[PDB]
Amino acid sequence: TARGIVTDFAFLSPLASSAASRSSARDDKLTALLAQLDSLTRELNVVSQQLLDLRQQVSALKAS
Amino acid sequence: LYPIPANATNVPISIPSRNWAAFRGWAFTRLKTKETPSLGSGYDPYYTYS
């Protein structure tokens, strides 16, 4: 039965009816997450662009 | 009972239209799947836990 039960796994009986509603909620969550991720990525990009300027500043600091 | 798949954080439960007279409380808990037998059926060939 060790190799027998590698087929016909368990089942999710009470999750058949809410298929449509849960899919809709998942897509809505995905939309929100995508918006948040886009905003965060743009913020990170501007932060990195700022962070390069640090090099210039420091090199400029070593002026004697 | 309701399933919570692996690494899932959201557990939505729905109830259709009903008449909630005398209802008094909800109570809850969370348990591991393999520990809970599939009650309602006499034998559970997959229940490998003691």
UniProtKB/Swiss-Prot annotation, chain A:
Q: Which residues of the full protein are shown?
A: 71 to 134 of 140
Subcellular localization is given as: Virion; Host nucleus
Further remark: This protein is only encoded by mastadenoviruses, and may therefore play a role in mammals tropism.
**Free-text note regarding domains:** Three N-terminal domains of hexon-interlacing protein form triskelions between hexon capsomers.
Q: What does this protein do?
A: Structural component of the virion that acts as a cement protein on the capsid exterior and forms triskelion structures consisting of three molecules that stabilize three hexon trimers at the center of each icosahedral facet and fixes the peripentonal hexons. Dispensable for assembly. During virus entry, recruits the anterograde motor kinesin-1 to the capsid docked at the nuclear pore complex thereby subjecting the docked capsid to a pulling force.
UniProt source species: Human adenovirus C serotype 5
The highest taxon in the source lineage is Viruses
Provide the transmembrane region boundaries: none
Fill in the subunit field for this protein.
Homotrimer. Interacts with hexon protein; this interaction tethers the hexons together. Self-interacts with adjacent proteins. Interacts with kinesin light chain KLC1; this interaction leads to capsid disruption at the nuclear pore complex during virus entry into host cell.
Q: Which family does it belong to?
A: Belongs to the adenoviridae hexon-interlacing protein family.
Protein name per Swiss-Prot or TrEMBL: Hexon-interlacing protein
UniProt induction comment? Expressed in the intermediate phase of the viral replicative cycle.
Q: Which ranges form a coiled coil?
A: 30-57
Swiss-Prot record, chain B:
The places in or outside the cell where this protein is found are:
Virion; Host nucleus
Q: What upregulates this protein?
A: Expressed in the late phase of the viral replicative cycle.
| The protein's role, per its UniProt record | Major capsid protein that self-associates to form 240 hexon trimers, each in the shape of a hexagon, building most of the pseudo T=25 capsid. Assembled into trimeric units with the help of the chaperone shutoff protein. Transported by pre-protein VI to the nucleus where it associates with other structural proteins to form an empty capsid. Might be involved, through its interaction with host dyneins, in the intracellular microtubule-dependent transport of incoming viral capsid to the nucleus.
Q: Which family does it belong to?
A: Belongs to the adenoviridae hexon protein family.
Span within the parent record: 653 to 702 of 952
Other known facts: All late proteins expressed from the major late promoter are produced by alternative splicing and alternative polyadenylation of the same gene giving rise to non-overlapping ORFs. A leader sequence is present in the N-terminus of all these mRNAs and is recognized by the viral shutoff protein to provide expression although conventional translation via ribosome scanning from the cap has been shut off in the host cell.
What is annotated about its quaternary structure and interactions? Answer: Homotrimer. Interacts with the capsid vertex protein; this interaction binds the peripentonal hexons to the neighboring penton base. Interacts with the hexon-linking protein; this interaction tethers the hexons surrounding the penton to those situated in the central plate of the facet. Interacts with the hexon-interlacing protein; this interaction lashes the hexons together. Interacts with host dyneins DYNC1LI1 and DYNC1I2; this interaction might be involved in intracellular microtubule-dependent transport of incoming viral capsid.
Q: What is this protein called?
A: Hexon protein
